[model samples]
Target: TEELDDASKVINYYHMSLAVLRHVANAKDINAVLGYMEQTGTAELLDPGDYFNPEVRQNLKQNYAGLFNVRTQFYDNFNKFLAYKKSKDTAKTAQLLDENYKLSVELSEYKQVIFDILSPLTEQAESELLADEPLKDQIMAMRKMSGTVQSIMNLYSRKHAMDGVRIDLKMAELEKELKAAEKIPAVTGYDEELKNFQSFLSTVKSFMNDMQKARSKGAYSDKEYQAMSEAYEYGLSVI
Candidate 1:
């Protein structure tokens, strides 16, 4: 006859958020995690501190804050990789991996602290299943654990570090092209057309630079990037 208590519900939300956070490689994904925490009342759970020991609650606040910081840096690196992928440049793509991987290592550690805090709750739920026969608790616990496994496995992978490099190479290549295009001498014939061509190229180059700056700073705007990409193609066609 027992159902999930408030503590159990909060623990489940924390587990679910951890599972979701594991795959967060971009700003948009992070935002989804943030929104989930808000809608699920996981963010608000920290305030009451009624469901957990004072020490556990304090630790949750500390570790979760650190985790948020590390994740922001981790995802920023990934966003750069995404940017480089557009240019398909190999060397710069590889360059971003080591740092990104290092960041992920820290990110995972903070998440583990939160997981440890909830460890007792999970144990209690399993115990209830074996004794009191609280089937819902057992079922929900299993579901949360299952979802978390994928995130844990993903965070352990080195491939994400490598992927993070892909984006920087792209922005680098575009900048190089812009530099070379700037040096092109004006032809005697079709001078006006040449001027227009260079103008478009410069505009495209500006957008690329802007995108690179934004991504480096952990600020990503899809609309702006898309506009730049469209301008880049048109600019290149003029050549």
Candidate 2:
């Protein structure tokens, strides 16, 4: 019994840490969060052996691996992105923009893995089980909670994609501006373009933060699904 309790606690902590990492990654100053993560030695806290159940352990391992991969990729892309933002070199910036696009796709794929696991868990909780109506309802609530989690993942993917498109557009505009400004650098309105790009980044960060708040509360309300669906539509429209 003690072992089981310990295992449960380990699993719970993993989920909590994952949530925190996701939120931190979405911040405007994500590198700061990464530095903090390294400083805190949180990675050492994880123990695969705690999950004795083979199936659970496998899923847990896969989930953690995916999260790590996605976060690492995003961090790399974000750093390159910031470099372009600071330098305002249209050609070099465009190259990094391409890399960011690929990374965004990779991030979305990993996020989908998170949704895949949570979706089934939610469904199982909502379905009738062994003719126990009360248990069925409890499970249903769990399902709703899971759905909320999936919704947040969807939101993250959508916002990330939107950011990519917004950045690409800004890079294109900057290229045009730079070409025209070559004759008169003083008149080249590069600052306005940079400001607009920054605004878009801020918007993306805000959406991510809102999703993170919803995730922390475990307050998976029915409205989240609707919001996620809308976000999906918006992202698709941009792409």
Model 1 lDDT tens row, 1-239 = 43456546555655565554544433335433332322311444334245566786788878877877787776676677667756775666566565665665566556656666765665665455455443333233333333233232222222223222334554555455456556655556666766665565655556556555545544334454345435543433211
RMSD of each: 23.3, 20.0
List ranges where model 1 is wrong by over 4 Å: 1-7, 15-48, 78-96, 125-130, 134-239
Q: Please give the lDDT score at residue 39 for candidate 2.
A: 30
Clashing pairs in 2: 122-143, 125-139, 125-140
Please list all clashing residue pairs in model 1, or write none if there are none. Answer: 80-167, 81-167, 83-167, 84-166, 84-167, 84-170, 85-166, 93-165
Model 2 poorest ten-residue lDDT run: 32-41
Best by lDDT: 1
Q: For candidate 2, lDDT tens digit of each residue in 62-120?
A: 76576667677767756665666567656665665555555555555555564455344
Instruction: Give residue 139's lDDT in candidate 2 (0 to 100).
Output: 30
The TM-score values for the models, in the order shown, are 0.41, 0.43
